[PDB]
């Protein structure tokens, strides 16, 4: 059935950008922040789950800094 709960924005997520990065024994990790909502908490997303929620956005940060 794929039943949906009640949220704000059509299952999408609405941010600002890639703020950091940063990875940790071995695992990366990908720090946005939330349409500049507070851009000193944020929440750290593996680079695995922050290009699939935020592949947007992702694909705009680390493209520019791995060149």
Sequence with gaps: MHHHHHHEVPQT???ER???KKIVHGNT???VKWKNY???DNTWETEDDIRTKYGDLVDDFEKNQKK
């Design 38 to 40: 507070s851009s000193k």
């Design 18 to 20: 890639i703020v950091r």
């Design 13 to 15: 997520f609405e941010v």
């Design 29 to 31: 990790s990908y720090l």
